[PDB]
Amino acid sequence: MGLQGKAALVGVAQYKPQKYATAPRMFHLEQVADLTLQALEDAGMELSEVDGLITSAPHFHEASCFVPAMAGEYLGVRLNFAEVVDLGGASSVAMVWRAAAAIELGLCNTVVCVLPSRMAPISEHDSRFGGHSTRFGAPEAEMDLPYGHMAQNTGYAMIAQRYGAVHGYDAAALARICVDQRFNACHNPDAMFYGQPITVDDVLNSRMVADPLHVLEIVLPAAGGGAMIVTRADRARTTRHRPVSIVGCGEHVSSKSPTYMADMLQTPIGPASAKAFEMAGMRPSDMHMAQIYDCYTITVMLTLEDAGFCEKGKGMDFLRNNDFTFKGNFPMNTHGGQLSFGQSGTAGGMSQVIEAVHQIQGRAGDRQLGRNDLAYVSGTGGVMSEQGALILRGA
Amino acid sequence: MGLQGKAALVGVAQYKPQKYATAPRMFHLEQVADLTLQALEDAGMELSEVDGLITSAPHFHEASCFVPAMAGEYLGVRLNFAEVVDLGGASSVAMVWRAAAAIELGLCNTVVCVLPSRMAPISEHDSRFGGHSTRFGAPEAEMDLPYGHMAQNTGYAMIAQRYGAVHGYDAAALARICVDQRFNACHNPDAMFYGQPITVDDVLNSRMVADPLHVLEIVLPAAGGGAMIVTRADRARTTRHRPVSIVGCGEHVSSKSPTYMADMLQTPIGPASAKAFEMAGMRPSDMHMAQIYDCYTITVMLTLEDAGFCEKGKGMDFLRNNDFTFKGNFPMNTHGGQLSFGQSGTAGGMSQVIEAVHQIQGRAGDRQLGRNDLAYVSGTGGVMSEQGALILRGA
Amino acid sequence: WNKPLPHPTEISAPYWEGLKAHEVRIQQCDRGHSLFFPRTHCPTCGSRSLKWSKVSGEGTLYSFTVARIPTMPEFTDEMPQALAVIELREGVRINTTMVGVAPEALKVGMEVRPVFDERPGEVTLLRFTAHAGSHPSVIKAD
Amino acid sequence: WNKPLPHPTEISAPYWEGLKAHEVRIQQCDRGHSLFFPRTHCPTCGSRSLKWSKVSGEGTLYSFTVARIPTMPEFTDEMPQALAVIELREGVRINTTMVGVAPEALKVGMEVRPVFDERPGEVTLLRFTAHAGSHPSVIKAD
Ligand SMILES: [Zn+2]
Ligand SMILES: [Zn+2]
């Protein structure tokens, strides 16, 4: 049951994360074409082979609706699967397994998952709340906003405060995530913070946003984008690189605000990762790498626990006693993660997937892992809201 | 390797189509809850069983993004599949096969497919192009709008005019679609035009909207909404009515504007229907009913041709030589279709799926088909843009 | 008051009206499930039989944080923002802020009691304080 | 013009500038595929090496319709709107309207000529007319 591993990632492409002030301006339709063709060239396939497309539903600059039709028309493809997702940072992992499902279902042969994240040029004839809805009837508009609750920082901070009171807290242990991932980024010329190492005290000395989260434990919004090609296992054999099979997946959404979680310390990556490991017939100890969605340090540590890599409540202990660099025993976000490689909006989650593909394909350069067969990848949207997991295995 | 038919429609719910003046206003989250619970009650299931949710992505009144999360939180369900679609009128059939794909893949036991279509209450603190985008970079904003091309009426008129030039045109033949479907609605107390029979003359003498399309050949806009429960085959055994298995599906999007179609007369419902018939191991001649998306009479005739019910260029004569009432030899849109039952905005296409479920479950009252086991269902968005096809089979 | 205010719907209206009467009123389905935020259905069992009833309003601090950068510039006069999540004895959770408690004494699990904030004017907001503290139950408009 | 006007992008600017020069410019990849609307890639083969080719603007009327109800009030002075789709000799299709011919006279497949509509002032639009007709190739602003 579940995915049988007959779909594989064969081509990737992504813009270098760059600050909004200086990043190139590109229409979202233009980005869709540019990123798809780049990823197709990386795979060694041409345009007419694409019979499936997945992208993000909200905030597509040129279309408030009919996004698949307009994007596919601009691209020039004939789609048997016209898909959009609306899961925030979890979107990237959500598109990957949907592409595999459609290919294993026989609907498609080759699916492109693409997320534009650069802003479009401005015309003379043409966000405070951080994504919270102000619409009449939206519960959070009347229950969150009047009290200052909004966006993501303070929500994740209240999760961190709950964890500290229940299981203990070590500010320096969480800072280990920033230091090791920055080390990884310091060996990635494409990373935003390439050549910019940090220390533990650097993180603690950075400004407090909301107790106990510091600015350096939080991603810096940036522009970018990315796309990935998924195709059938047989066609994958004649592509350019090692196929990266999609052998397990999981998805879970049980709340929007963390306030209505059954337990803010039981995050949805638990159920999602248990389904993905089960589907792949594998266990956390089988993985050679973990590309973990890292908008906040606390999200990484909670993913470490709930995905089964360490015991619930010993996350700080796991962070103190392990080396998370590409030279370490538990390589993690070996591209730098969104924290240090840069967060390209909703495409930031795709950096995790692409790095897993790079590592498995033997294309990671100075950061290449010795064991590069098996990868766990997570995606997280909102504040512990939307979650997905992937198990990937090289051919 | 398509669907194995292990998911089934078990419960439906549908607001009666109403003009926007009589139409009550409810929040889209409110409609999600109300319609979901009505459909669950129709199937005899509980809210606790729902672990999958599909709805429409754009113009969700209370949320421009994170629609699955806000709706799932408001409804109170824990989702292993959080899905949105952006395919216009083809959204309903698109949701059904996605729900079956997730159930057969093992992620969900029960998926709710819901489309709010009533407007929300207005507030002090809170569209002349008919859905066309005006955004900078949208191709139709500069290639369509300044020349008056927009909305749907003229686009379908230009497809009809092209057909008449290539294959000949018979306006009285199209009128039979209106007459026979109105006859069906005349035996449907829930239909908008219940008890109001019309003749071919009434259709031909109605006002011309855009040559060669008459007023009576075009749906009128109305408010409504619908929900649909899909569940595993085994759980469907103990639900209240006959399970309606989803044995075949297909999807195709190859153009937004018909101007860029390879050929406006070769429409994307063909490829989608061929895949659905192939996957169900079935032929058009095996169907006991055809519930065809009918926002325009020309859509129905082209769907009959391209789906395989008659030869290309012969659709005019098929309309002349067959009886499309529920008493006829080719029962079609037996609830009256959107033309005579009412078009509930985006939820209009759901009326085609619901009527098939009603027929297959033996719940269609006076219009009940004696032979009620196999159904072909189509959904169409835009101007022959987004297309989906379903083959449904009673248990 | 330049901050965001609630714009009650006809679904949530009885809750914001109860606060105006210095009462915390939440819905309870006919099977015994309390719910919040307000809905037209029970998010636990789906029942449509909901009854509004006053609750004592006391509970525990489920979690909290202290904003050192204001979440919005118009919350500067509330700084530092003691953002809090309260779980009433009924088991529902309410977003709010703490008043009359030093940020450094905030502690996950403290007993809390409601404070009705009339400063916005026509709208009454719901804040919380330490149960054993002396902070009054109402904050009148300036 | 009070009606909607094109807002050219850096991608489509050469086409709209071409109309100002009384030219119909259509992109072609170096593999020979023509494309419209304008893009930065070939929608056929994915090539990024595109050139702007000068075409005669001649073609055939692919389809048409006569608007009896205005697509919006702003086009009432153009009634009845002869909405049209032209297929150029090179194979691309263009949305437009027909001028210099009766709307009810049109026929699918008839040969057409381009007509550069300068009436909006700074923006020139592309209309079409019968190839054998007497309508000029330009409409000078009023
Ligand atoms: Zn209940
Ligand atoms: Zn080309």
Residue numbers in the entry:
A (entry chain C), B (entry chain A): 1 to 126, 136 to 404
C (entry chain D), D (entry chain B): 3 to 144
Task: Show me the paper's own sentences about this structure.
The steroid aldolase from Comamonas testosteroni (CtSal) forms a complex with C. testosteroni steroid hydratase (CtShy). CtSal cleaves the C5 side chain of bile acid thioester steroids, whereas a previously characterized actinobacterial homolog from Thermonospora curvata (TcLtp2) targets the C3 side chain. The proteobacterial steroid aldolase, CtSal, catalyzes the retroaldol cleavage of the C22–C23 bond of bile acid side chains. Each aldolase forms a complex with the hydratase responsible for the preceding reaction in the pathway via their DUF35 domain.
Crystals of the CtShyDUF35–CtSal complex diffracted to 1.95 Å resolution. The CtShyDUF35–CtSal complex adopts an αββα heterotetrameric (diprotomeric) architecture, featuring a central CtSal dimer flanked by two CtShyDUF35 domains, with a total buried interface area of 9540 Å2 (CtSal–CtSal and CtShyDUF35–CtSal interfaces; calculated using PISA). CtSal adopts a canonical thiolase fold, consisting of two pseudo-symmetric αβ domains: the N-terminal domain contains a five-stranded mixed β-sheet (topology: 1, −5, 4, 2, 3), while the C-terminal domain harbors a four-stranded mixed β-sheet (topology: 6, −9, 8, 7) (positive integers indicate successive β-strands oriented in one direction, while negative integers indicate β-strands oriented anti-parallel to these). The CtShyDUF35 domain comprises an N-terminal zinc finger and a C-terminal oligonucleotide/oligosaccharide-binding (OB) fold. However, while the zinc ion is coordinated by four Cys residues in all homologs including TcChsH2DUF35, CtShyDUF35 coordinates the zinc ion with only three Cys ligands. The fourth coordination ligand, His36, completes the coordination sphere by forming interactions with the zinc ion via its more sterically accessible Nδ1 atom. In CtShyDUF35, the repositioned zinc ion compacts the β1–β2 loop against the α2 helix in CtSal, drawing α2 closer to the steroid-binding pocket. Consequently, the β2–α2 loop protrudes into the active site in CtSal, occupying the region where the steroid nucleus binds. The CtShyDUF35–CtSal tetramer has two distinct pockets separated by the β2–α2 loops of both protomers, unlike TcChsH2DUF35–TcLtp2, where shorter β2–α2 loops create a single long cleft across the TcLtp2 dimer. The 30-residue β4–α4 loop of CtSal forms part of the wall on either side of the substrate binding site, while its central region (residues 127–135) spans the top of the active site but is disordered.
